Amino acid sequence: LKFTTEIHPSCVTRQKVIGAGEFGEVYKGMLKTSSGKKEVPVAIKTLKAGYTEKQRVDFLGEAGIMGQFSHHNIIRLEGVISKYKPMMIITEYMENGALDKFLREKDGEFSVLQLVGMLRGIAAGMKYLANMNYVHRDLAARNILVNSNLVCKVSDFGLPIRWTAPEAISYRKFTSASDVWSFGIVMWEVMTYGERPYWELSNHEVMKAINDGFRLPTPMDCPSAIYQLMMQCWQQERARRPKFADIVSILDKLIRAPDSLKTLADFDPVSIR
Ligand SMILES: Cc1cccc(Cl)c1NC(=O)c1cnc(Nc2cccc(C(=O)NCC(C)(C)CN)c2)s1
């Protein structure tokens, strides 16, 4: 297993709170590295006093998982503070935060090519994860982070019906192929600027629609090839779904011949006459 750096508390400064929970908080801060020669912005997640053994195992387990990975589209672990309390996980700082929230605050502002490029990055991260024999099980735009350069990184590895493939819902059969289903939902989240999958439907109503063969309709301004790809991610029979390598390849081919993205899937209308 790859080595997780134990960071000395004197090397970490917390500057601003960016989120809080029952278990602890997430801060923006700075990390001194390379034995004082380098300083980088970081995110810092804490586990505050009173945490249980299960909470510790999950908390440091996520750091141990993250530390195994070295990929452009996976959040980088700087290290952990475990010898002192409160314990901390320290990652690179992603300036634009969670992808779903980011897109909802930037509705309509990106090009189709930019959105497809975000999906290519997420797909490359997922291909890496799956190849490393990791199943994410909770892939959703809320677990993707975005930096100032619009690079998207798979970010939350702690482990939600409407992102989950039918065989994972009904049989707990979580695999890379059920992650591919989830990726298809993420494609829809991105192309809609963070719409809620299935809108007002309840979890039971989503299960009803999907098992009857219903699938999410096309986003507005969505290339036909992109809608076709997310539909293939939602094949009921998992063996018929693309592998992440197929997804990355298809997205690459579309980006390299961008006029291919100008053929749009029909956005089915509300009658205004
Ligand atoms: C530290 C850590 C441990 C385990 C797992 C992970 Cl993924 C992390 N790292 C992080 O959670 C984060 C890394 N980068 C983050 N950036 C972030 C998250 C949420 C909000 C913002 C942010 O600054 N958003 C802009 C707004 C609009 C909220 C104004 N500040 C930025 S959060």
Swiss-Prot record:
Protein's GO biological process: activation of GTPase activity; angiogenesis; axial mesoderm formation; blood vessel endothelial cell proliferation involved in sprouting angiogenesis; bone remodeling; branching involved in mammary gland duct morphogenesis; cAMP metabolic process; cell adhesion
Organs and tissues of expression: Expressed in brain and glioma tissue and glioma cell lines (at protein level). Expressed most highly in tissues that contain a high proportion of epithelial cells, e.g. skin, intestine, lung, and ovary.
Cytoplasmic side: 1-273
Region spans: Mediates interaction with ARHGEF16 and ELMO2: 5-273
Sequence positions bearing Phosphothreonine: T46
Keyword Phosphoprotein on entry: yes
Protein kinase domain: residues covered: 12-255
Binding site for ATP: I18, G19, A20, G21, E22, F23, G24, E25, V26, K45
Residues with Phosphoserine modification: S249, S271
Induction: Up-regulated by UV irradiation via a TP53-independent, MAPK-dependent mechanism.
Mod. after translation: Autophosphorylates. Phosphorylated on tyrosine upon binding and activation by EFNA1. These phosphorylated residues are critical for recruitment of VAV2 and VAV3 and PI3-kinase p85 subunit which transduce downstream signaling to activate RAC1 GTPase and cell migration.
Disease note: Cataract 6, multiple types: An opacification of the crystalline lens of the eye that frequently results in visual impairment or blindness. Opacities vary in morphology, are often confined to a portion of the lens, and may be static or progressive. CTRCT6 includes posterior polar and age-related cortical cataracts, among others. Posterior polar cataract is a subcapsular opacity, usually disk-shaped, located at the back of the lens. Age-related cortical cataract is a developmental punctate opacity restricted to the cortex.
Family: Belongs to the protein kinase superfamily. Tyr protein kinase family. Ephrin receptor subfamily.
Designated name of the protein: Ephrin type-A receptor 2
Gene: EPHA2
Full-length numbering of the shown residues: 602 to 894 of 976
